[PDB]
C-alpha cells in the first residue's frame, strides 16, 4: 500500500507496533462497514444511475455520501499499512 | 482547494448543483465536528504527549483515531470544494 494521508506518518510516529496494529485492525473493521453501506446504496439504485445517465435526487445523495466516506477512510487504512509494512489479522 | 481524493470527480460528475452544493454544505459542518473532536482530546493530552516525547496507551490511541478521521474528511472535503469552485454558505 502506498501512503494517501501524509498526515499520519506524523500522527502515528514512535508509536509502539501494539498500538498501531490495534488502530489499523479497527481501521479494517471500519472499512468493511463503510464498504458494504455503500454497496448496499449502490445496489438498490435504478439502472440509470448506476450506469450514470441520471444523476441528482436524495436516493443518490445518499449514496455519494456513503462512498464518499467510504473511500476517505480507505485512504487512512491503506496510509496506515503502508506505514505498518503489512495488513494485520 | 486541490482535488485529494480523485474517486469524487466521477462519484459527483453531473450532480446538479444544489446537489453538490447540498453534500458541501454537510461536509462542511461535518469537518468543523471532527476538528472540534481531535482538538478537545489533544488539549486533554500530557504535555509529553503532545510535545511527542511520549507515545502509546489508549487515551493517545483516542486522540490520533478521532485526528485520523479529520484528516480523512478534510481530503475529501477540500476534493467537494475544488469540484465545486467555490466554499458554499
Not at 494517501?4 to 481501521?27: C, H, Q, V, Y
Amino acid at each position: 500500500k502506498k501512503v494517501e494521508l501524509r498526515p499520519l506518518i506524523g500522527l502515528t510516529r514512535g508509536l509502539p507496533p501494539t498500538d498501531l496494529e490495534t488502530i489499523t485492525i479497527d481501521a479494517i473493521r471500519t472499512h468493511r462497514r463503510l464498504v458494504e453501506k455503500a454497496d448496499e446504496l449502490f445496489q438498490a439504485l435504478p439502472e440509470t444511475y448506476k450506469t450514470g445517465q441520471a444523476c441528482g435526487g436524495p436516493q443518490h445523495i445518499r449514496y455519494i455520501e456513503a462512498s464518499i466516506e467510504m473511500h476517505a477512510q480507505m485512504s487512512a487504512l491503506n496510509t496506515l499499512i503502508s506505514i505498518l509494512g503489512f495488513i494485520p489479522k
